C-alpha cells in the first residue's frame, strides 16, 4: 500500500487513486447539466443558497469561453475557473493563428490534454471538477463532458455533481421520447425541470436556478445567459412539474 499517497502512481490494479479521489470532490459538488438541442446547446446549474445574505443573481457560475462556447462545472469551483482561464488562452491562440473561432471538438481536446497533463506528475494535483461544455460551430451543435482523468466524450445530454443519477435518468427519458430532436426553447424548459428534480438530493438548503444557451436560431450561435421573462417562464414550468 501507499499507492494512493502520490499522483501519477499506478496501483497494482492499473489505477490512479489520486484521480479517483478527485472524482469524490466532484460528486460532493452541486448538480450541473447540459442538453444538446436541434441547433445548439443548453447549460444549467444548481446554486445552493447557503444564507439569505447571498446577493441573488450575482455569484455567476456558468462561464463563457470566446463568444460561442459555454462552460459549467461541479466540484472545486476554483479548479474550474483555472481550467476556463486556460481554455480562454487556448481559444485565443487558435483564433490568432487560424483566424476562425475554435471548433468545439478542437476546444474539447485542448482542455482534455491539459487536464490529462495533471495526471502525469506527482508535483501537481488532479483537477477537482467535472466540466460540462459546448457550443455551436461550422459543423453544428456539440456538447461535451470532461472528467478529472482527462477523459471526455460527446453527449446528447450530460450531468454531474451530487444529483447526477436523478438528472441522468431524466435526460434518458428525453432521448427516448424525442428521437427527431428537441428545440432550443424546449431544452431550456426541460433544463429547469431537471435541476429542480435533481434538487431532491440537496433538499436541505433552498437553491437558485441559473441557465445559459447557445443556439443558431435563438442566439445567432453566440453564448448568452437566460434572463428575465424567459428565465421566469422556465422556473414556472419547472415548479408546475414537481407539484
Amino acid at each position: 500500500t501507499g499507492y494512493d499517497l502520490s499522483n501519477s502512481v499506478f496501483s497494482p490494479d492499473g489505477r490512479n487513486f489520486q484521480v479517483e479521489y478527485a472524482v469524490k470532490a466532484v460528486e460532493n459538488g452541486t448538480t450541473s447539466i447540459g442538453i444538446k438541442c436541434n441547433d445548439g446547446v443548453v447549460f444549467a446549474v444548481e446554486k445552493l443558497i447557503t444564507s439569505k445574505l447571498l446577493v441573488p443573481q450575482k455569484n455567476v457560475k456558468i462561464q463563457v469561453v470566446d463568444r460561442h462556447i459555454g462552460c459549467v462545472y461541479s466540484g472545486l469551483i476554483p479548479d474550474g475557473r483555472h481550467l476556463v482561464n486556460r481554455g480562454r488562452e487556448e481559444a485565443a491562440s487558435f483564433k490568432k493563428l487560424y483566424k476562425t473561432p475554435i471548433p468545439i471538438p478542437a476546444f474539447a481536446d485542448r482542455l482534455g490534454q491539459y487536464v490529462q497533463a495533471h495526471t502525469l506528475y506527482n508535483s501537481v494535483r488532479p483537477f477537482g471538477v467535472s466540466t460540462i461544455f459546448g457550443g455551436v460551430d461550422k459543423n453544428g451543435a456539440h456538447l461535451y463532458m470532461l472528467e478529472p482523468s482527462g477523459s471526455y466524450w460527446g453527449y446528447k445530454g450530460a450531468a454531474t455533481g451530487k444529483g447526477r443519477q436523478s438528472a441522468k435518468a431524466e435526460l434518458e427519458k428525453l432521448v427516448d421520447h424525442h428521437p427527431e430532436g428537441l428545440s432550443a426553447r424546449e431544452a431550456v424548459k426541460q433544463a429547469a425541470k431537471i435541476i429542480y428534480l435533481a434538487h431532491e438530493d440537496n433538499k436541505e438548503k433552498d437553491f437558485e436556478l441559473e441557465i445559459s444557451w447557445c443556439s443558431l436560431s435563438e442566439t445567432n450561435g453566440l453564448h448568452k445567459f437566460v434572463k428575465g421573462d424567459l428565465l421566469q417562464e422556465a422556473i414556472d414550468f419547472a415548479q408546475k412539474e414537481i407539484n
Binding site: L5, S6, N122, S123
Partner: protein, 244 residues
C-alpha cells in the same frame, strides 16, 4: 511530491559523520589493494586486479593505473567508471594549467583540484559521492617526488608510503616496518610486491593479477620517465624479486 524519494546524500549523522562518504569508504575497502612507495630516486605504484579470468585480455586492459600527464600518474581503488570521470577531468585541468602558465602543473595543485570536486559532492547537489580513492604518484621541480592520496570525503594527505583499498590496515603495518628514508626505487619495487604478496586474498600472486608502474629520474639526464609495466615485464620482476 518528489521529496518522498530523496535519500539526502549530503547530511551529517548525529555523530557528525557524512553517511554516504563512510559507506563509499566501505565500498572501497572491498576493492583491489593499491600501494604507493616513494624513494629518493623515484616512485613505485603497484596494484592488484580483482579476481580475473583466463579469457581476459590483459595486455590491452587497464583498471588500476592511469596516466594524468607525462609527470603524474594515479592508482585507483573503487568504482572504475567513477574514476574515469575524475581522471578525464584531471587530464583537462593539467592541460589548462599548461596552456595558461606554459609550465607543467605542480602535483599538489592537481591533487587539490580533484579533491575539491569530490568535496563538492559531499556538501551540495544531492548526488551520491564518487566511490573512488586515488594514490597520486608524480614529480615537479618544487618538491620533487611526491605521493598523495584522496578519498570520497575530498580530504587529501601526503605520504612516503601508503596503501588504499582492501587490507590497508595489514598493508600499512608491513610498509611501516620495512620502509626507510634512504631507500631506492629497486628496493621500493621489492617492498611493494612483497607487501601485496602477504596481504592478498588470492592463493598466490601472479603476473596476470597485477598492474605495476614506476616514475623514475632514471631517464637520460635531468628528466622524468613514466613506465607502465607490460604483462611480460611484470612476470620478469616477479621472478627477479623471488616471489614466483
Amino acid at each position: 511530491g518528489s521529496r518522498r524519494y530523496d535519500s539526502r546524500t549530503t547530511i551529517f549523522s548525529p555523530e557528525g559523520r557524512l553517511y554516504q562518504v563512510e559507506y563509499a569508504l566501505e565500498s572501497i575497502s572491498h576493492a583491489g589493494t593499491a600501494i604507493g612507495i616513494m624513494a629518493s630516486d623515484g616512485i613505485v605504484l603497484a596494484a592488484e586486479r580483482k579476481v580475473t579470468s583466463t579469457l581476459l585480455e590483459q595486455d590491452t586492459s587497464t583498471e588500476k593505473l592511469y596516466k594524468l600527464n607525462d609527470k603524474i600518474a594515479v592508482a585507483v581503488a573503487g568504482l572504475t567508471a567513477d574514476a574515469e570521470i575524475l581522471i578525464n577531468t584531471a587530464r583537462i585541468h593539467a592541460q589548462n594549467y599548461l596552456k595558461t602558465y606554459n609550465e607543467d602543473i605542480p602535483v599538489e595543485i592537481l591533487v587539490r583540484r580533484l579533491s575539491d570536486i569530490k568535496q563538492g559532492y559531499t556538501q551540495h547537489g544531492g548526488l551520491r559521492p564518487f566511490g573512488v580513492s586515488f594514490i597520486y604518484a608524480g614529480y615537479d621541480d618544487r618538491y620533487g617526488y611526491q605521493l598523495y592520496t584522496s578519498n570520497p570525503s575530498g580530504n587529501y594527505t601526503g605520504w612516503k608510503a601508503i596503501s588504499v583499498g582492501a587490507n590497508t590496515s595489514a598493508a600499512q603495518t608491513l610498509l611501516q616496518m620495512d620502509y626507510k628514508d634512504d631507500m631506492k626505487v629497486d628496493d621500493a619495487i621489492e617492498l611493494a610486491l612483497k607487501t601485496l604478496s602477504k596481504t592478498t586474498d588470492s592463493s598466490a600472486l601472479t603476473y596476470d593479477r597485477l598492474e605495476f608502474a614506476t616514475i623514475r629520474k632514471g631517464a637520460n639526464d635531468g628528466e622524468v620517465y613514466q613506465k607502465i609495466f607490460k604483462p611480460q615485464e611484470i612476470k620478469d620482476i616477479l621472478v627477479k624479486t623471488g616471489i614466483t
